[PDB]
Each structure stands twice: as C-alpha cells, then as structure tokens.
Amino acid sequence: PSMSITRLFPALLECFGIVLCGYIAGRANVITSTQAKGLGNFVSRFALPALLFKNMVVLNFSNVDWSFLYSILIAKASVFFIVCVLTLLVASPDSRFSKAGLFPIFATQSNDFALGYPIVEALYQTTYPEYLQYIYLVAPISLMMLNPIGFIFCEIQKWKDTQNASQNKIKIVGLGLLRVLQNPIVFMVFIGIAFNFILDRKVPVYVENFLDGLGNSFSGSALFYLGLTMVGKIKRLKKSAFVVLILLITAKLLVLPLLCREMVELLDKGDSVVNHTSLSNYAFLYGVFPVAPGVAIFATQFNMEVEIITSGMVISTFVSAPIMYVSAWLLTFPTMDPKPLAYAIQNVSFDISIVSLISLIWSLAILLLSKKYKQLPHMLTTNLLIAQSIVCAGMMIWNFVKEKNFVGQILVFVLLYSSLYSTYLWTGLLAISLFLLKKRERVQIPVGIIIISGWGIPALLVGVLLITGKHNGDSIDSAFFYGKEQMITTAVTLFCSILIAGISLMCMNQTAQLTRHVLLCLLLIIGLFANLSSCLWWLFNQEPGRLYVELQFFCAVFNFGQGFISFGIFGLDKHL
Amino acid sequence: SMSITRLFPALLECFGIVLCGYIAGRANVITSTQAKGLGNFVSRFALPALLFKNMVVLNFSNVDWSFLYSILIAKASVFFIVCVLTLLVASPDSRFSKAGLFPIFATQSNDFALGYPIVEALYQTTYPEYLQYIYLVAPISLMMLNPIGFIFCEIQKWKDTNKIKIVGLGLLRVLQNPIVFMVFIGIAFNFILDRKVPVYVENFLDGLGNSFSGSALFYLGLTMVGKIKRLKKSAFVVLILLITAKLLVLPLLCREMVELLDKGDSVVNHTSLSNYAFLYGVFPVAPGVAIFATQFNMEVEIITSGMVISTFVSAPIMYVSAWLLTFPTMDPKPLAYAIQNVSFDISIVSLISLIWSLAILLLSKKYKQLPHMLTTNLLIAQSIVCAGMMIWNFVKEKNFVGQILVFVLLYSSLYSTYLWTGLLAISLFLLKKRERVQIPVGIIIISGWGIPALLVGVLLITGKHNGDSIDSAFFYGKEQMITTAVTLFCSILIAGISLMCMNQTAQLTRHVLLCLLLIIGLFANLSSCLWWLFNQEPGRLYVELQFFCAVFNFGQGFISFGIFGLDKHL
Numbered sequence A: 001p002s003m004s005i006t007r008l009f010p011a012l013l014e015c016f017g018i019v020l021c022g023y024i025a026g027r028a029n030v031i032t033s034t035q036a037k038g039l040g041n042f043v044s045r046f047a048l049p050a051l052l053f054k055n056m057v058v059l060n061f062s063n064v065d066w067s068f069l070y071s072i073l074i075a076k077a078s079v080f081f082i083v084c085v086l087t088l089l090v091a092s093p094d095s096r097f098s099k100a101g102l103f104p105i106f107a108t109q110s111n112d113f114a115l116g117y118p119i120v121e122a123l124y125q126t127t128y129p130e131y132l133q134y135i136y137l138v139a140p141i142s143l144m145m146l147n148p149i150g151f152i153f154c155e156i157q158k159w160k161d162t163q164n165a166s167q168n169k170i171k172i173v174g175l176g177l178l179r180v181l182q183n184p185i186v187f188m189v190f191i192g193i194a195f196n197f198i199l200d201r202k203v204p205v206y207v208e209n210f211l212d213g214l215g216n217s218f219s220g221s222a223l224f225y226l227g228l229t230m231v232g233k234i235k236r237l238k239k240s241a242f243v244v245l246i247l248l249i250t251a252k253l254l255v256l257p258l259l260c261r262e263m264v265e266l267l268d269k270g271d272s273v274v275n276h277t278s279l280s281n282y283a284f285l286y287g288v289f290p291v292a293p294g295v296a297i298f299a300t301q302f303n304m305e306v307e308i309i310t311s312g313m314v315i316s317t318f319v320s321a322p323i324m325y326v327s328a329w330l331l332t333f334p335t336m337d338p339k340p341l342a343y344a345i346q347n348v349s350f351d352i353s354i355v356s357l358i359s360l361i362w363s364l365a366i367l368l369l370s371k372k373y374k375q376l377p378h379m380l381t382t383n384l385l386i387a388q389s390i391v392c393a394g395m396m397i398w399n400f401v402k403e404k405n406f407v408g409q410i411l412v413f414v415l416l417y418s419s420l421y422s423t424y425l426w427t428g429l430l431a432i433s434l435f436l437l438k439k440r441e442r443v444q445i446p447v448g449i450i451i452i453s454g455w456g457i458p459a460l461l462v463g464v465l466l467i468t469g470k471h472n473g474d475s476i477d478s479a480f481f482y483g484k485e486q487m488i489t490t491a492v493t494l495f496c497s498i499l500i501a502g503i504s505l506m507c508m509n510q511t512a513q514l515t516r517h518v519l520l521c522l523l524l525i526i527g528l529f530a531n532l533s534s535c536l537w538w539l540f541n542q543e544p545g546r547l548y549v550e551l552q553f554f555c556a557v558f559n560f561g562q563g564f565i566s567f568g569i570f571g572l573d574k575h576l
Numbered sequence B: 001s002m003s004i005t006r007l008f009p010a011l012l013e014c015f016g017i018v019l020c021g022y023i024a025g026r027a028n029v030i031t032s033t034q035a036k037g038l039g040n041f042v043s044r045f046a047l048p049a050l051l052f053k054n055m056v057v058l059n060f061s062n063v064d065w066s067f068l069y070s071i072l073i074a075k076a077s078v079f080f081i082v083c084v085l086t087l088l089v090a091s092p093d094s095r096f097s098k099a100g101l102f103p104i105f106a107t108q109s110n111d112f113a114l115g116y117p118i119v120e121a122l123y124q125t126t127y128p129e130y131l132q133y134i135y136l137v138a139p140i141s142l143m144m145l146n147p148i149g150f151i152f153c154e155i156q157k158w159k160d161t162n163k164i165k166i167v168g169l170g171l172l173r174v175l176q177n178p179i180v181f182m183v184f185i186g187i188a189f190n191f192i193l194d195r196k197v198p199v200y201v202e203n204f205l206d207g208l209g210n211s212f213s214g215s216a217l218f219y220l221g222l223t224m225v226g227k228i229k230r231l232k233k234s235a236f237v238v239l240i241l242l243i244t245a246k247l248l249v250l251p252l253l254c255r256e257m258v259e260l261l262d263k264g265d266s267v268v269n270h271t272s273l274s275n276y277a278f279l280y281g282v283f284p285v286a287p288g289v290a291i292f293a294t295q296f297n298m299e300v301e302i303i304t305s306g307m308v309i310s311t312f313v314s315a316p317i318m319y320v321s322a323w324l325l326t327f328p329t330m331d332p333k334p335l336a337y338a339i340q341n342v343s344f345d346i347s348i349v350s351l352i353s354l355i356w357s358l359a360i361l362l363l364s365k366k367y368k369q370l371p372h373m374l375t376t377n378l379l380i381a382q383s384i385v386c387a388g389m390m391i392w393n394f395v396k397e398k399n400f401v402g403q404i405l406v407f408v409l410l411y412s413s414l415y416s417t418y419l420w421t422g423l424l425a426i427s428l429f430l431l432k433k434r435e436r437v438q439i440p441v442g443i444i445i446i447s448g449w450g451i452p453a454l455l456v457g458v459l460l461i462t463g464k465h466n467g468d469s470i471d472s473a474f475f476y477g478k479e480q481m482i483t484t485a486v487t488l489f490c491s492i493l494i495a496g497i498s499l500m501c502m503n504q505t506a507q508l509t510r511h512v513l514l515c516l517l518l519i520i521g522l523f524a525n526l527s528s529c530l531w532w533l534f535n536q537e538p539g540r541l542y543v544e545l546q547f548f549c550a551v552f553n554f555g556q557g558f559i560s561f562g563i564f565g566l567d568k569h570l
C-alpha cells in the first residue's frame, strides 16, 4: 500500500484537539496572556532543544536519501524566490522592504516539530520508518539556508528607518546572521551534529532517559502553547489585506507542495518505482504544513507588521487541517483495487462527519442558549444546522447499518436523503428569505408554511424515490441506493434549489444578521455547484474514471462537512 | 529480579528536570505569575488526561487486591499515629489545623510525577504488572484519608466564626480535585468500552498524557524558588519529625504489613512484591499539599518548607533503599561490582554539584574571609575524592603501579577530607574564643597534606598489597584498615573536642550544621572498621554496613552543596 492512511485522522485529531484545548483555556480565562508567555518560555527554552538533541544524536547518516532533501530544499528556495520577487514589485515603496523581509519567511517556514512530526509519525511508523528523520533534517537546514535572506531584508528596512546613510553592509548582514544563529533550532542542530560524530551515533545511557523525558513533553505542550498564543489575534482586517492574506496562504499551502512534488520527480534518479511514488507523496505532504509561530515571534520582536503575520498564521493553521486531510486521501486513492474505494469514501465521510457533528452541536447549543432564535433570519439558520445534524446522525447510523437488513437500510437511506434534500432546499429558502428581507417590503413571510414545505417536500421526494426507484443490492455506496432514479431525484431537488438561490442572487445585485447570512447562502452554492457536476459527469461518460472518483470524493467533502464551515463562520464569534 | 541496574538513569530524569525547573525559576526566566500558567496546564489538562488513559486500559481481573488493602492500611496507620500525637502535644489554639494538615502531609506521595518514572524503569521488562499500582493506590488513598484530616481543619475554620456543614465542605473539596473525579470516570469507562479507548481518541490521550511526565517535574522544580524561608527551633524540630515520619517509618510499615497480609502463595512474586512495597513509601511529599495549605491559609510556611525539603531529601534515599534490597541476591563475587557501581553513580552527582558550589564560593570572593577559607580548602578536597572514583572504576585490571597510583590518591584524599572537617570546627571554636589568626591552620594544612601523605607513604614503602581484593577494604590487606582506623580515630577526637568546647563556652548559622551533618557520618564510618576486625567470617550484616560506609564517603559532597551552595551571589 506504501501509505498507512487509515491512522492519519487520529493524528489530526490529537494535533488539533490539543490546539483546541489550548484555545479553550485561552479564551475562557484559565490562563491569561502573561502565564501563557511563561508556558511558552518553558516550551521554547527547554522542550525543543532536548528533542532536537536526542533526534540528532540518534540520527543515522548512512540511510539518508539526500535526493529528496535537496529537491525539497530547491522547492522551498524557489517558492521563497518567487514570493520575494513579486513582493518587491507589487508592494508600496514606503514599505516594500518590510514586506519583502517578512512575507517570504511566512510563506516558506513550516510548523514541523509541533504539528508535522506526530502526523508523519502516524503515517510512516508501520511501513516506511526512515521518513521520520527527514523532518529534523529538512526543517533546520531550510531555516539556516533561507531565513538569513529574510532577516537581511528586514535589516535593510530597519536601516531605512534609522536613515544613517553610511553603508558598512557587513555590520547588517552579520547582524542578521547572528540573529539567525540565536535561534535554538540552528545551534542546537549544530551541537547535535557535532555530538553525532563525537559519541559515535549512540546516546549516553545516563542521559538517554533524561533526554527522552524532556523531549516527549514537547508535542502536547507545544500544541497547547500554540492554542494559548492564538486567542484574539485574528481581529478585524482592512481592504486589500484580505486579498494579500489569501494570496500568501494559497502560496504557502498550495504551490510549495506542488513544487516539492515536481522537483522530487525531476531530481530523483532512483531505480525503484514504489520508493519514488512514496517519496513523491511524502513530498506533497510536507509542504502543506502550516506556518510556525516563530514568524510571529520575529514580527513581534521587530514590531513590524505583527497583525498581518499573526492573522496569516491563524488562518493557515485553521485552513490546513482539511487541506491535509483532502490532499492525503487524494494521494492514497490511485491503484489499490476497484472495490475498496467505496469503503474509503465511507471512512472519509465518517471522519469528516464526526468533526462537523461535534462543531455543529456546539454552534447549535450557542445559538439556542443565546435566545437569538426568535429573530429572523437566524431561526432558519438554526433549522439548517439542525438538518445538518440529522445528516451527520444519518452517517452514524449508516456506518453501522450497511449490511444489517434491507428494511432498516431503506429506512436509514430515506431518513438520510430526506435530511440531505431538506438541507439542499433550506439553502434556497434561506436565500429567498434573505432576498425578501433585502427588498425592505412589509410582506409577512409565512415561516410556518415554509417549515411545513421544507419538512414535507424532502420526505415526499424520498418516498417518490422509494416508490418509483429500484433498489440496487450490489451497491455498497449510499449514492447508488436506488440506482439512476436516486441520482435523478437528487439532481432535480438540487436544481430547484439552485434556481431559487440564483433568483435571490440576481435580486441582490439589483437591490444593491444580514452581514453573515448572505455568505452562508453564497458558500453553499459552491457546495451545490460541486454536487451538480458529478451527476453531469456520469451520463456523458459511461466509464467511471479516476476523475469521477476525485469528483465524488469532493462531493462527499463539500456535501457533508458543511457544518464545519457553518461553525467556522457563525459559532466563533463574540457576544453570543 | 528487580532491574536495579536501570534505576540511576531514572533518578537523573526525575531530578534533572526538577533541577532544570529550579534553575529557570531562580534565574528570572519564568517568574511567579508565569509559573502559575504552567501549573494550570499541568493540573487541569495534562494530569486529567493522563489518569483517564491508563485506567481505561488496565485490567481489573489481574490486580492483586491483597497488596492493595495492605498498602492502604499502612498509609492509614501512618495517618493514625501522626494525627494522635498532634492532638496531644500541640498548642490548644491550633490543635485542629495541625492535626488536619500534618497527617495529610505525611501520607500523599509524589506518585504520578516522581513515583511513576522510577517504577517504570525498575518494573517494565521483568514485572510489568507492577506499574498499574501507582494509578490505583494514590487516588484511593486520597479519597479515604484526606477527608478525615479535612474535618479537623474545618473545625479550626469554624472556631474563628451542624455536622453536615463541616463534613460536607471537606467532602466536596476532595471530589473537586482533578485526581478524584477523573478516577471515577475512568472506572466507569473501563466497563463501558471494555478496556478499549477508541482509535480516534487513542492518539489524543497519548499526546496529552506523555506531556505530564516531563512538565510536572519542571513545575515542581519551578515552584520551590525561595520557598525554604527560615524557621525557628520549634518549627525545625517538628519538621525533622514529619520528614522522618513520611520518609522512614511509612516505608518500613509498608514492607512489614505487606509481608503480613499478602499471605505468600507467590514464591518469587511475594518477595519481589515486598521489596516494591517498601519502595512505594520512600517517595517524597506531593506538591499538592503545599497547594492544599494555601487554600486553607493555615500553617503555610511549615508545609511548604516540608514539601521542598522532602523532594530534596528523598533523592539519595531512593537510591540507597533500592540498592539495599537487591543485595541479598546473586553471588558474593558480583556483589563487589554492585558496591563499585553504586559508589561510581553517587560520585557523579556529587562531583557536578561540588564543582558548582566550589565555583560559587571562589567567584563570590567570600573565600578571602578566614572562616570561609577553611571551608573552601575542605570543599576542594571533596571534589578530588569524587574524581578519584572515576579513575578507580576504570583502573582495576591494569598494571600494579597504575592501580597503586589510583589507590594512593584516593585514600590520601579520603583521610584529608576526614581530618579537614574537624580542624575547621576546632579552628572555628578557637576563633570564636580567640582573636588570633589561624596561623597554625597553615601548619595544619601542611600537616593535612603531609599526614595523609605519610599514610600514603607507609603503604608505598611497605609491601602488603593484596591483589585478590575487589573494591577497597583489602587494598593493602589488614594493614590498610588498621591505618584507616588510626587516621579516623584522630579526626573524630579533634571534632569531638570542638563540639565539647562549644557547650562549655556557652555564617555560623549554617557552618555548624555542615560540621554537624558530618558528625553523624564519622560515627557510622568508625563502626564498619570495628565490625571487620571483631569478625572472622563476613556475615550479611557486614555487607549492609560496608555499603553505607561507601555512600557517606563518596557522596559526602552532595550534603555539603545542599547546605552552603544555595545561599546567594554577588
């Protein structure tokens, strides 16, 4: 298989549950900012050097495939190079140097030791154990060979601020180099490299247990400190700052991994195909890691665009968790055997539905306890989140009732597709209600009649698909329970909702609470747009290709992880 | 059967992280307000996650319950005796606060932070079922003994200002402890999921539970900065009694009651269980007791000082006690390797701490004072003894001359440290009564460098070296032990005269105790020399006494560093 992809989701659950625990402790009032500063002082001055010293003392230089290492470093250097060049061209002259010195560090440095190491440990203990050392090999060399260029740029900008006009470029570039060398990772890696040759690859027995005890405490405490640093750093941004954060985070999380994969297939001349494919998949997985908090530390000590870099980190850190999941499950998809892709789709939808259901339970509890349900339009939003909770509960039933009885399977399918179709048309009803409220017309909206329609029409569609459709016993996936009749019924329900939302969207342009309501209608249309395309692909192409598999996987993710997006938009808000 | 070889790396982890936390605390790296956040993480997030994971996984079917209520009766018995005399002997205005805080302090060990790594090192590859007993005894001991103490402290709170009102307050504070209610949920979830955590939850509990085993000791080291304070005579005396109770008579009660209540029927397992039961009581006082005294705001100084003292004092007690249990085993010939290994491992920690204390005294320019000058002379000699053991472990099968050279330096250093403690005490007694400069101390230092050299010279001049000796008692045969006895008797008489001159005449606050703590050491050193001459066939009692002679000879620098080094700087 060359990838133990079943046990990736527990690693992302650990790595983001400890981050969530740190965030909860930060926002509550359990640990204030100063005490989180003390925990970070402990982590950054004791835990990371012991971990690095142990993993470089035990590091084996005989089995290291250097080709992957300098291919990944060439990729990171290329990403840094393009981002610095366009940062010099497109930024304003008054602050081109500050952006050119801090943005490529943000878009080139990864959170390897805190987040990357447990995930790679979960994915690469069982079959390919030699890939664990590449984190500790690549991250400090990348730091040492790419960070000084950024600190050089930030120090020219600091020279700009001093406006001395005396040159002596040595005084500045050596200042940047010594600021780089004061990082604990670089000189601690130097000490570990020296002691690897001094001790002859063997940790002393008197110090081994002490270093293991101090190093094993880095992961959880580091994720907890990341969660404690992350309270309240997002704030409200300004025009064009949204676009430059999108461009930087797309660069870091998208074009660096593709460059890593392309340079790995370009620079590796190995004679083994399975080793080459696993190296390419690991190269894709390495670049999707989020930005380390060291960039925000550097901007804080510099007092230099601290808000932009911190906002960039909290968005890339939140955003990479599904990007990691989707990318790794897309990478493990090809070859295999035709039949276990259905089990893979069911397992991925189950792991997504767990997190969406938990976040949806939290957001529903917040919306109910805040007593904001009585005012329009948030009542229909509460109904929508309730319907998505029934979809997720339908997956909880469907994972365990796949092969029990035909009658129970039919009832579970009817309930699950009723909830799915109700969510589908509730998006259109919310959009129509938003369009009616945007008109500022004194029209009494029949919310009770709308709820009766929304609870009856999907049930009628499920009953019609049961009565007229033919059940397919050889289909283990939920999408082919009734065959082509069910997909035709899902297309008609989705097309009517898209037409209703399309009329409301066209009314919004002519007419131009409501600040967020529109985007939840907007973001669902992209979800409904991806559902339509996989149904259109099946009639015109008789042969199910790999693109059909990729489109069905994205249909599953954008259909059943919508509660996560809804929680991210509404639930993480103050006052309520 | 005990893996006693791998105890000393565990004692380096458990006290090196505490030392790392203390240095960062005293320096100014983490101040007091910031240390609270690290404690908040450990006490609210790492410890509850740790407790929940290891009890859902452990099997209740194979737990030897006989050991469980035997260990608990011993802790209950210690609590009972300490509570009884605290009501009789204390002042009437504070009988209830002392009777409620002193016996809780003498019963809760540091099992989750300090006890768990030591038991893990000793009991993984040979007896792996003994590791689950840490997580069983410490919370059960908490629920059935802490409320009994807590009733008395709430009466004292009542005194300044209905039995439900008092006993329910003590009872409801215990279930608010994270240890107590997390153990309740883990026992329930052991039966719900049938000894299996879900795969989606396995990694989350492991990541949060492995971060306790390092961070809690760091916070324990960080909490003790500046907490020792100063105490009066009556508080020093009750503190000695309390630390003696927790670290001495509680472990001996555990061993005796476990051998009485398990009723054998285990062959090799009962003997191994008895040694482990004695080891459980040696663990120091948990830092939760100092936390407990803070929320009560009663007897805060004594309990905090007792906790910061018990963690330090228990560090050699763990090593000596565990190595004494493995002695009645193997054969007499690899017993010599066991004696050599313990002395080498003690001398490592003593030498590193001695280098620090010597550096502090030299750099701070307090050595220019005449009373502190003799301590510096004493402390340099203690550093060279420890370095001599590093040579002797590696020079045993080499040429006779190299063996002789290692032996001459080590025993020269041993007699000089022995007599240098007494001349300084005599010089301090002479300086306290006479204003004359210590001009004979220079002649004494020449003597102290010459008299050991003369003893060293007699062994070089007279050919009586016995090669069949392994460690040290037969280096020159009976001639070396006779020479060591004459040197030891002259040093004890000089120190005895200085102690007697202090009573007849009636900085100096700590100087005396460093002289005092050595006096308990030279009398135990003298008895082992007397034991060898008055006995032809070496018995088993001679083996235990010879080991104790080795520890106070080669780790004597550790006691000196703890008294003098951690005072101040300039």
Ligand SMILES: *[C@@H]1O[C@H](CO)[C@@H](O)[C@H](O)[C@H]1NC(C)=O
Pocket (backbone or CB within 6 Å): A271, A272, A273, A274, A275
């Ligand atoms: C990768 O290494 C070599 C390729 O030269 C070959 O044995 C095989 O393709 C792989 N081996 C292992 C052990 O993964």
Ligand SMILES: *[C@@H]1O[C@H](CO)[C@@H](O)[C@H](O)[C@H]1NC(C)=O
Pocket (backbone or CB within 6 Å): B265, B266, B267, B268, B269
């Ligand atoms: C411990 O268990 C039983 C106790 O009766 C016995 O086999 C022996 O003493 C020990 N056995 C093992 C395998 O440790």
